[model samples]
Target chain A: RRTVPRGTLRKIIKKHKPHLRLAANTDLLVHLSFLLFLHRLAEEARTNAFENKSKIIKPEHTIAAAKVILKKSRG
Target chain B: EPEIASSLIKQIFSHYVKTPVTRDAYKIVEKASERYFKQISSDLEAYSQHAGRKTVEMADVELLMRRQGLVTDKMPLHVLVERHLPLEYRKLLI
Candidate 1:
């Protein structure tokens, strides 16, 4: 049973949400980072597709979104 | 020719800047520049193998990027995929 202490969790969130200061649960962070990227990709892809009159996310759109996301991230 | 060359250079530059790793833009650009200058030739087959291509297509860039783990999701995908891109229209299938 892993108890998440509020003070420690709050500190972690505050520091990382902007500053990324701690290394505890780094593997979890990496997973979360990847998930965040995918979520953002899906969100933006849907928005763009809606704007462009597309019913589905074409590979080109995925390619574009991937490009946009990667260029925007750590590489 | 100068204009054409300069425009092409600018396109590449813009891609790098708009790249997802733009947050750490300096570091990625620095490393990319270094890789650009540090040239070593490989056999054509080896190069193709590096790209995992029976016949290379621009999409192979994405595949290679995936293989390199430069893109576990999206971040490094943008920063790491610059030069791996093939010339245009190959994947258009039109």
Candidate 2:
């Protein structure tokens, strides 16, 4: 669920990691999937804010969820 | 029975990058693509029904994909811009 195109992501990653070479586009796709995963997490934080009757979802809302999500993923 | 041909999956990967794909990687895409197709078809069926139509249309698929956030560029320009705006900028407007 990338807002940007796959080519753009590939170009950006390649630019950032000059010495890095991806074995396949699927590898890049898998790497970019993490961004989409984060997008979903942000949506979940927004949903939490809505449920709490908050008019807007701020960075704090996302950070709170990010803590739990990162912990689970890393652990 | 692969929903997507292994060769087609291989070609798709080769189209963008120069890396070699393993047989295991091919299976991964085959299964993932098939599962993705199933979900999209299910959504399309429900969308067509909701529209009171017997036949599924391209419009149904487009609408379903849009709702699932699979086609972000198809979204309204204002909505896309707002979503990408900084938190402080958005807070000022709201």
Candidate 3:
């Protein structure tokens, strides 16, 4: 099975938290965390969709979702 | 085995999605689905434990489904029977 590559994750960590030392299997956990957050976000996005009475999922759906989702998801 | 088959995943994905699903995308979804089940196992463990009991009961499973908003409580039990399960006995035994 494919996973979020170490190289891809390393670049992200290096830019934001450059002072930290990397550890084994750490990147995998970060990747795991991302998808879970996204899954939670999907619920909100779909929720926003119906609240506004839209048949199609729009950009605003995710935009509204991110504001609410990030506040709780940010740790 | 705690694994979904490649063919099964691909076929199911195509059933709903219009676009051609990629191999890597399949892998992504495969892992995501597994993670969900793992999460369910964690919840089921706590739920079962909350009853202060040792063995898992059907009630635990029912609560798990209801808590997650599954509306199968008062359903026809149709697709489940048509797709995989053998609900023929339940039809008349009630």
Pick by lDDT: which candidate is best?
3
Give me candidate 3's TM-score against the actual structure. Answer: 0.44
User: Highest TM-score: which candidate?
Assistant: 3
Kept native contacts, as fractions per model, are: 0.00, 0.00, 0.00
Tens-digit lDDT track of model 1 for A1-36: 112122433243333333223233322322223333
Which residue ranges in model 3 land beyond 4 Å of their true spot? B1-94
Candidate 3, residue B69: CA error in Å? 19
lDDT of 2 by residue, B2-52 (tens): 133456444544333333334554454344444444444455456667877
Q: Is candidate 1 or candidate 2 better by DockQ?
A: 2
lDDT for each candidate structure: 0.36, 0.43, 0.47
lDDT of 3 by residue, A22-74 (tens): 45444443333344444555566567767978754455665666567554442
- lDDT minimum window of 10 residues, candidate 3 chain B: B77-86
Residue A7 local lDDT, model 2: 56
Indicate whether candidate 1 or candidate 3 has the larger lDDT.
3
lDDT of 2 by residue, A1-75 (tens): 222244543344344443433333332223223333344444555565567676655445545545554433220
Candidate 1 has an fnat equal to 0.00
